[PDB]
Amino acid sequence: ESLRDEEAYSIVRIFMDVDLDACLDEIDYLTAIQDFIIEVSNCVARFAFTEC
Amino acid sequence: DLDENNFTTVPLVIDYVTPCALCKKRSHKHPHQLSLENGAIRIYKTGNPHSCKVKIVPLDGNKLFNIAQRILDTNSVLLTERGDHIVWINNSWKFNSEEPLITKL
Numbered sequence: 001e002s003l004r005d006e007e008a009y010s011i012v013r014i015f016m017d018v019d020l021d022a023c024l025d026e027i028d029y030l031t032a033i034q035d036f037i038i039e040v041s042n043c044v045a046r047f048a049f050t051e052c
Numbered sequence: 053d054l055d056e057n058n059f060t061t062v063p064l065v066i067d068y069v070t071p072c073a074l075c076k077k078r079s080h081k082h083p084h085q086l087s088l089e090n091g092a093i094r095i096y097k098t099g100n101p102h103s104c105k106v107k108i109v110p111l112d113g114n115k116l117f118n119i120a121q122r123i124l125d126t127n128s129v130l131l132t133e134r135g136d137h138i139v140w141i142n143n144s145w146k147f148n149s150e151e152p153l154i155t156k157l
């Protein structure tokens with residue numbers, strides 16, 4: 001998937017790509033994703049507040 | 053029922069009159085589980101973990117912080133509207149801006 005026009009339909013959603021070359025069990029995966037969500041949402045919100 | 057060696061072994065069964073504070077469900081399928089790892093007790097659900105969330109409780113030490121918490125739990129130091137600290141020493145509430153009394157307490 002790509003963008004057909006960068007001049008009018010530049011509007012997109014917030015997205016990220018993660019790839020870790022290791023295997024995690026269920027509990028570690030769940031705690032990791034909770035912490036990841038909190039940290040990333042806080043960082044993006046702070047950037048939006050201070051620049052946008 | 054939990055003691056120093058079974059805390060990571062026996063499931064925990066609760067009475068689900070009220071919804072779980074972690075999963076927002078009336079009654080869970082299976083009893084929750086505890087785990088110990090690098091100085092933190094982690095509580096989660098058994099069966100389908102994605103049904104519920106995971107909670108972390110940290111326990112690290114800091115004798116001095118524990119002492120401060122224990123002293124604070126006796127309600128012997130209070131902070132007033134004006135911002136001065138009052139301490140309970142020798143059957144009296146004492147405050148003194150120039151001479152701090154928290155160390156005396």
Ligand SMILES: [Zn+2]
Binds near residue numbers: 073075097105
């Ligand atoms: Zn739950």
